[PDB]
Amino acid sequence: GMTDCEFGYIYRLAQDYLQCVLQIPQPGSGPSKTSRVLQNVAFSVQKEVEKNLKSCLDNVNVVSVDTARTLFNQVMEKEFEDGIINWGRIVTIFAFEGILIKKLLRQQIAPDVDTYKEISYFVAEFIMNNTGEWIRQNGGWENGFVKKFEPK
Amino acid sequence: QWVREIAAGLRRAADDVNAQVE
């Protein structure tokens, strides 16, 4: 509904996606319908990006949460600089946090099992503050994203 | 220099997604 553009809902989506990448999803009912749809499309994008950008992704050394945030914010600023927002660009935000969590799992100097909660936090901040209005105006996650991306 | 390269790659991947669902 209209409130799915607020921080808690977005943070849960961002955290769910990292838990999918790390193979530690929440128990019970597990992820919502939105998360289930998002994880398939975001993962497909993630794999393509990892392949197509292999050479320039080898240059990055994500040694801490702070450097992950700095790189995330720099990349997002450049990706979104032209002011255009659409669902494909929103999906790439999730794909990119998946790349970052994988680099951290290998490169973080002071690894901490809560790290994915910190990464997904700054991802949610960006999505909410920079794309949340567009998301709301385009039907949110339920009436916008899921309607367009759920299976045919 | 790779910050801009990554961002350009994400813009391209986003366009591929949009081309599919739209």
Author numbering:
A (entry chain A): 0 to 151
B (entry chain B): 1 to 22
Provide passages from the article that reported this PDB entry.
Anti-apoptotic members of the Bcl-2 family are broadly recognized as promising cancer therapeutic targets. Human anti-apoptotic proteins Bcl-2, Bcl-xL, Bcl-w, Mcl-1 and Bfl-1 have a globular, helical fold and function by binding to short, α-helical Bcl-2 homology 3 (BH3) motifs in pro-apoptotic proteins, as shown in Figure 1A. Competition for binding among BH3-containing proteins regulates mitochondrial outer membrane permeabilization (MOMP), which is an irreversible step toward caspase activation and cell death. The role of anti-apoptotic protein Bfl-1 in cancer is less characterized than that of Mcl-1 or Bcl-xL, but many lines of evidence suggest that Bfl-1 is also a critical target. Thus, Bfl-1 is an intriguing therapeutic target and biomarker for resistance to cytotoxic anticancer drugs.
We used computational models to design a focused library of ~107 candidate binders and screened it to identify three peptides, FS1, FS2 and FS3, that bind tightly and specifically to Bfl-1. Mutational studies and high-resolution structures revealed that the high specificity comes from a BH3 binding mode that is markedly different from what has been seen in prior structures of Bfl-1:BH3 complexes. Crystal structures of Bfl-1 bound to PUMA vs. FS2 show that epistasis arises from a substantial alteration of the Bfl-1-binding mode. FS2 binds in a shifted and rotated orientation relative to PUMA, and does not make a key salt bridge that is conserved in nearly all structures of Bcl-2 protein complexes. Interestingly, sorting for Bfl-1 selective binders enriched sequences that score better when modeled using the FS2 binding conformation than with the BIM or PUMA-binding geometry, suggesting that this structural shift may be a common feature of many sequences that we identified and a general strategy for achieving Bfl-1 specificity. The FS2 structures now provide a springboard to permit the design of further improvements in Bfl-1 selectivity, affinity, cell permeability, and other physicochemical properties. Crystals of Bfl-1 in complex with PUMA, FS2 or FS2_1fX peptides were grown in hanging drops over a reservoir containing 1.8 M ammonium sulfate, 0.1 M MES pH 7.0 at room temperature. The peptide was built into the difference density from the rigid body refinement and the structure was refined with iterative rounds of refinement and model building using PHENIX and COOT.
